[PDB]
Amino acid sequence: QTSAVQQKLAALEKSSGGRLGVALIDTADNTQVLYRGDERFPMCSTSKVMAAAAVLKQSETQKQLLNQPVEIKPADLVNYNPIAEKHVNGTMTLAELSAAALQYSDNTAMNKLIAQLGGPGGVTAFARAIGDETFRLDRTEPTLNTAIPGDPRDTTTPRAMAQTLRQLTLGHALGETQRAQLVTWLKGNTTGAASIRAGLPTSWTVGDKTGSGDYGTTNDIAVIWPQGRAPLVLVTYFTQPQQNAESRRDVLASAARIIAEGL
Numbered sequence: 001q002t003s004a005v006q007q008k009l010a011a012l013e014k015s016s017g018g019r020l021g022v023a024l025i026d027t028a029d030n031t032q033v034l035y036r037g038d039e040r041f042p043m044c045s046t047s048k049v050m051a052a053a054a055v056l057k058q059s060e061t062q063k064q065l066l067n068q069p070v071e072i073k074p075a076d077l078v079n080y081n082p083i084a085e086k087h088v089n090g091t092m093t094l095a096e097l098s099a100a101a102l103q104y105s106d107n108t109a110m111n112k113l114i115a116q117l118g119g120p121g122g123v124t125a126f127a128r129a130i131g132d133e134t135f136r137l138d139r140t141e142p143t144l145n146t147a148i149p150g151d152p153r154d155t156t157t158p159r160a161m162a163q164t165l166r167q168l169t170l171g172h173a174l175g176e177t178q179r180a181q182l183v184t185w186l187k188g189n190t191t192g193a194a195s196i197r198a199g200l201p202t203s204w205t206v207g208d209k210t211g212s213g214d215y216g217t218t219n220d221i222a223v224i225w226p227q228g229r230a231p232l233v234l235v236t237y238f239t240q241p242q243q244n245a246e247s248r249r250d251v252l253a254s255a256a257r258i259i260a261e262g263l
């Protein structure tokens with residue numbers, strides 16, 4: 001059966017032309033609101049949270065790891081390198097790579113995080129270790145954003161990603177300093193103003209990571225702190241039938257506006 005929330009999300013989806021996936025977790029009582037919550041969607045850059053978190057986890061036993069410089073060579077640059085392009089024939093530390101990947105969605109930075117973990121399978125292995133049985137990372141940047149209909153590579157479900165984001169930021173999948181660092185990075189994101197944040201009250205604190213890819217894939221995952229209330233986790237994934245479709249961040253803002261009612 002459906003609630004009024006799910007009915008509103010279905011109407012938004014119908015108007016949008018695409019396929020919408022939503023998962024809300026209310027940490028006051030662990031209740032969940034799901035819309036296509038167990039369908040797979042292409043993660044695109046939302047996968048960068050798992051990669052950064054995996055490096056944070058490594059740093060719990062190698063305590064200087066975030067300070068380690070990593071060389072950036074011309075050959076490393078991919079399709080979207082806003083921060084890494086300033087360091088060609090130079091370096092960025094693992095902390096700097098994590099900040100660039102998360103806060104600017106730099107794709108070269110993500111490739112360095114993936115390499116630090118031994119490849120896409122190392123990111124997936126971290127996911128499994130923290131209890132995410134759904135996430136899979138198969139490719140590096142930029143091919144992980146192809147977002148082809150029916151392709152299971154580089155996908156997860158809204159339910160699984162919301163549970164993981166909760167465990168990484170509000171729970172204890174990471175150590176105490178690492179969890180705080182991830183929260184700081186997500187709160188300082190620069191790419192999210194038109195997505196979930198645009199549908200929520202401006203007084204609420206939000207940490208988020210966006211994603212964009214082919215098939216007009218438009219995603220955002222967020223941890224949300226209303227002022228006088230237990231925090232929430234919200235995943236909004238959206239993908240479209242046409243390879244060339246334009247981005248639809250407004251759909252994510254609209255989904256967030258629906259979900260926020262009564263919270």
Ligand SMILES: *[B@@]1([O])O[C][C]([C][O])O1
Pocket residue numbers: 044045046079080105107142145210211212213
């Ligand atoms: B993620 O999705 O955020 C931006 C970049 C563009 O390739 O990837």
Ligand code: NA
Pocket residue numbers: 083096099100101103104
């Ligand atoms: Na940066």
